[PDB]
């Protein structure tokens, strides 16, 4: 088939209401990464 | 985690507390040398 634009921003929002950024920003602030020069 | 996110501030702050206490020791010996010099001044004024 094909995917046009208005279908595709909808598919982005459907992929985007599922992900979680808060757990990853906790993950980059754990004690195994926290001082990094 | 709320105790883990706040370690660096408390570490460097406590390091400052160590520094200022060291220099309070340095002035603590210096003041007694000064009082000794004041006593020498007193007896020499008594001599003159």
Mutate to test the interface with A, among B3, B5, B9 (most CBs of A within 10 A): B5
Cα angle value B30/B19/A30 (rounded, 5°): 175
Token code pair at residue A25: 């920003």
Method used to obtain the model: cryo-EM
Instruction: Tell me, yes or no, if A32 comes closer than 8 A to chain B by beta carbon.
Output: no
- B4 and A31 in contact by Cβ < 8 A? yes
Contacts of B1 in chain A (CB under 8 A): 26, 29
A20: alpha, beta or left? (left if phi > 0; alpha if psi -120 to 50): beta
Query: In sequence order, what DSSP letters do the residues of B1-48 get, joined into one string?
Result: -TTTSSSHHHHHHHHHHHHHHHHHHHHHHHHHHHHHHHHHHHHHHHH-
């Amino acid at each position: 088939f094909r995917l046009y634009w208005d279908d595709l921003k909808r598919k982005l929002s459907e992929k985007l209401d599922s992900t979680d950024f808060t757990s990853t920003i906790k993950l980059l602030n754990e004690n195994s990464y926290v001082p990094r020069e | 985690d709320s105790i883990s996110y706040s370690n660096f501030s408390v570490a460097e702050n406590f390091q400052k507390m160590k520094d200022y206490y060291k220099e309070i020791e340095k002035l603590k010996i210096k003041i007694l040398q000064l009082i000794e010099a004041i006593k020498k001044y007193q007896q020499h004024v008594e001599e003159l």
